């Protein structure tokens, strides 16, 4: 084992949504083995990081990250709403997110 997990794996789904209205201030995250409201509530304060890669280097690196807070659970099935410092782009909508164990 080189490198340690220390986060729950997650999938950044769409934004918070109507049927045909967008609301990009919130994203919806699916957290791996969390299937209910109650279980989702455990994560409610935890910090979430969408890390992603780019071609050009930036602070001398190819990886950057946008941070978020996990604001609230999102109805019955263990999805959570996450609010990020800067809105996540929809290029992300299938992607992995890391939901950290901090706080």
């Amino acid at each position: 084992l080189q490198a340690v997990r220390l986060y729950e794996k997650g999938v950044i789904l769409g934004y918070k949504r109507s049927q045909r209205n967008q609301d990009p201030n919130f994203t919806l995250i699916s957290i791996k083995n969390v299937n209910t409201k109650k279980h989702a509530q455990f994560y409610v304060g935890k910090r979430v990081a969408y890390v992603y890669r780019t071609t050009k280097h930036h602070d001398g690196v190819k990886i950057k990250c946008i941070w978020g807070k996990v604001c609230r659970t999102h109805g019955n099935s263990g999805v959570i709403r996450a609010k990020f410092k800067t809105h996540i782009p929809p290029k992300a909508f299938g992607d992995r997110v890391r939901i950290l164990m901090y706080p």
Binding site: N35, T36, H39, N76, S77
Partner: protein, 180 residues
């Protein structure tokens, strides 16, 4: 306590009367048991029934008491007979249906579902006239008779209603409906 299971029909004793007049100082009081979802609904039902039966409207009468009847033995199975008046799209009918249940309230809850389901009779169109426990010598309906059989036994052919936690959409192995 389980709130996913409940049906919030209670039974209410309502007593009311017409407001006294100089010409009729001591009017008659009327009572009824009414199956209703809450106390206010019960009251309204009572008023409606008064209007239907006597000359009495909410504005010229007064409710004397509304009590709320809780079942005395809410864990004893009983066989309830009910007599309804209901309205179909074509006309109006009486019927007598029987429900094996744990309380009058439960029976009434069952009844409303059944009328809705079997006859498309919505709650508005129904009037429960009497429910009474039928001792099992006088039970006329075969689906109740069967339950009243001596040493009752049956298998469990229902499918599992797993908790939403352990309902996972990908399964390792094809589950089994047989169980045992």
């Amino acid at each position: 306590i389980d709130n996913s299971l409940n049906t919030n029909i209670h039974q209410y004793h309502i007593v009311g009367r017409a407001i006294p007049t100089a010409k009729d100082k001591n009017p008659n009081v009327y009572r009824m048991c009414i199956f209703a979802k809450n106390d206010t609904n019960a009251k309204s039902r009572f008023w409606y029934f008064m209007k239907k039966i006597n000359k009495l409207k909410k504005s010229n009468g007064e409710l004397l008491a509304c009590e709320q009847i809780k079942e005395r033995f809410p864990l004893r199975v009983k066989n309830y007979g009910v007599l309804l008046r209901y309205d179909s799209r074509t006309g109006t009918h009486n019927m007598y249906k029987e429900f094996r249940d744990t309380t009058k309230e439960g029976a009434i809850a069952q009844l409303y579902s059944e009328m809705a389901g079997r006859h498309r009779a919505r709650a508005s169109s129904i009037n429960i006239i009497r429910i009474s426990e039928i001792s099992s010598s006088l039970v006329r309906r075969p689906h109740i008779k069967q339950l009243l059989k001596r040493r009752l036994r049956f298998p469990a052919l229902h499918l599992p209603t797993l908790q939403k936690e352990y309902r996972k959409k990908f399964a390792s192995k094809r589950p089994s409906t047989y169980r045992m």
